[PDB]
Design a protein around this ligand. Sequence first.
Ligand SMILES: [Zn+2]
Lengths: 189, 373, 50, 65, 32, 132
Amino acid sequence: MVLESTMVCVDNSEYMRNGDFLPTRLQAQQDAVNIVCHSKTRSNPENNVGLITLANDCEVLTTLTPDTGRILSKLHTVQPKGKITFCTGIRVAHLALKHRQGKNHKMRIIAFVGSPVEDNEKDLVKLAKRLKKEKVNVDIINFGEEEVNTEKLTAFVNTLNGKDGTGSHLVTVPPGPSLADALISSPIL
Amino acid sequence: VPGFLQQSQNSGPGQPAVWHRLEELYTKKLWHQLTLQVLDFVQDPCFAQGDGLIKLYENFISEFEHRVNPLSLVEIILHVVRQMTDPNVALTFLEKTREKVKSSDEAVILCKTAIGALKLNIGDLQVTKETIEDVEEMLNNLPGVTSVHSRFYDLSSKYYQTIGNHASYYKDALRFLGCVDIKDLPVSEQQERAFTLGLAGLLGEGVFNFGELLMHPVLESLRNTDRQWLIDTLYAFNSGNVERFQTLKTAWGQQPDLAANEAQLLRKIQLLCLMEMTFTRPANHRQLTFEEIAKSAKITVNEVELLVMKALSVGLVKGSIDEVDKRVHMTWVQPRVLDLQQIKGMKDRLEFWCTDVKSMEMLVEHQAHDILT
Amino acid sequence: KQYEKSENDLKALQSVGQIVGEVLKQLTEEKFIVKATNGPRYVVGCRRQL
Amino acid sequence: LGLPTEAYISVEEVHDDGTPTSKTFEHVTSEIGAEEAEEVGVEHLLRDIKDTTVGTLSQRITNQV
Amino acid sequence: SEVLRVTHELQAMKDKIKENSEKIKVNKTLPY
Amino acid sequence: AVDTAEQVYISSLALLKMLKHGRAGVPMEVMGLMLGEFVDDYTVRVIDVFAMPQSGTGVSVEAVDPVFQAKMLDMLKQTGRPEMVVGWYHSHPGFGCWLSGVDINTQQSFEALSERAVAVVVDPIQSVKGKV
Ligand SMILES: [Zn+2]
């Protein structure tokens, strides 16, 4: 049923400690989890999930797996301390996805872009110019910090599509600390 | 509670631009962004008398501090206490803050260093020494910080008001400079920080001149201008060409700590002269005559043997002393720093050696070719 | 704690054991004649570190 | 030359003298060893060059070269 | 939360320890 | 349908692994499945071999526990190749290089699985010095 795997870029930045959607922010990145993909396996029990941090050049905390206990356990210890990283963060996820089994599974990166990034203007050349020929899918979640609407980040999906793409959508839930229903209902996925 | 911030619009520079905008910062229940603004504000030029108001604000924000990264929190607490500058008040505040944030976080280190600094101004033996040893021992598991390490080093070096810790004092100053990341310092501070290390290195009992200082950045960029009798002294010492003219002006510059140790300084200069004279010889006729030592050391013929014996005993050469032949035999285990021009001789020696080795290898290979295979 | 007490339990289930014997002479610096409690005799030496 | 492998260690000792911090990998001496019941394997697998004391005088001269 | 870190996260000894005891048992050969 | 003077090629690493695994457990008997390529009707080649933890009463049909057999061959392909299982370690410490009735019973099933698979026998005690 699911023609896709799953890798997630769970933010870890120093700014991630903030009251903007709930308790201490990240406490909410954790929030979807238990649905951030709980919904994704709410699909045929053959889906695959992942995890990738994005601070201090970012490490990887989960290798594609139709299991969730490990991802939750690692999520419990994601202490935020450091400047966010991108581009490199996305390429690490891209490689990890390439090392996916069951070639039938398509790719998907859900980017929880929270704290501001330092990406330059024409990052598209590496950010998106590949996903077409690589037929990759990337999703963007803006944990607030929407500085001037972060057109810089919006340009990533903008480079996406070109006719059809965007994945689900680059949904920037409003800074209103409503909840994750915005990351539960909004995502038709 | 917030009314304090509301009415705190006056009594401080940058009122509108800082506080008025900051208001939204906590109205959005927001965070460590606020801490960064706070850091900028505290570092701002201010006589720092409103420490009570600032501190009440800090307590209010840190009630659920969490988002206040402990490292920044400790930095701000140390700055505020240093601005308040009341001895017992600050000491009690430091103890309370340190205990309250007692986590395994690498900030209790910073607090302990601050406490050592605070107590460093009085009773500098009982509690301070134990505290400095404790900070040293607990300073592990994270060499990459490079900041709490700098603070601890600076505390130690400021400890320099103590005779015994000298060579380690030079070591501490060197470590400060090395792990201070960039110099990132005002020229004003750098001048004194470099003169202090210069005097320390000159006065240490085992330290002679410790080359690589001359191109060590802390000195030149700050001292090249003027008031640099010390640098000429450093050049003379690392060269050892007596050149004891400089001391007539060095004493005037600093009678204390220099004139008080003329005997020790001159003994070191004599030893360094002996070493450098042994080094300038072309490694073939290392056997030198007491006449040479005297003429290069302005010491008596009789005293030469004692000077060489002292050099051996300290451990800068490993030759041997003989008399009936009126000569001395040296052999080295203590090498020093060099410069580009002095590397050309080494390169030439290596090239000649490589040519000779190739020649001998080719000779053996050619002649023995019958039985080699 | 149960997993800890089981890991070493299974790990130790590899050791094979030695044969208890009393040395008799010192043939060389690396050859010592050794007997066994059962009775047969052999010629052996230290391992690499004794 | 005789470099089949080299060993490195990652010690992050900050610095001495006046240097800044860095990665500062470090080198550990290495040598290719052997274990009985495997030395036999290698002996058989080679069994042609046999560069032991065979032809001792010639081998000594080649060693000097 | 606390439980999810313990319901199946952690508590894995009920699977690993089960398996591990399986091999220690299986190696209990009949002779002694 | 008929054998001949056929050559089995074992890789150098394969031989080394056979000997090391055999000597590690000399007092007991060990078992290790072989991976390789079925080159042609008269050339069976094994590139590398892998060991199976010493469980059971000894060399028997228990060494093929699927839980362990599948997971190694799997992860192994992820990096390298799938060379199909071709043979087994086996090991007779002090019993020459013979095959006993139990060993025949075992290899019968492996023959069934394959058609020409081979059974190796590596002696970890007698083979020393310069003997294989
Ligand atoms: Zn058998």
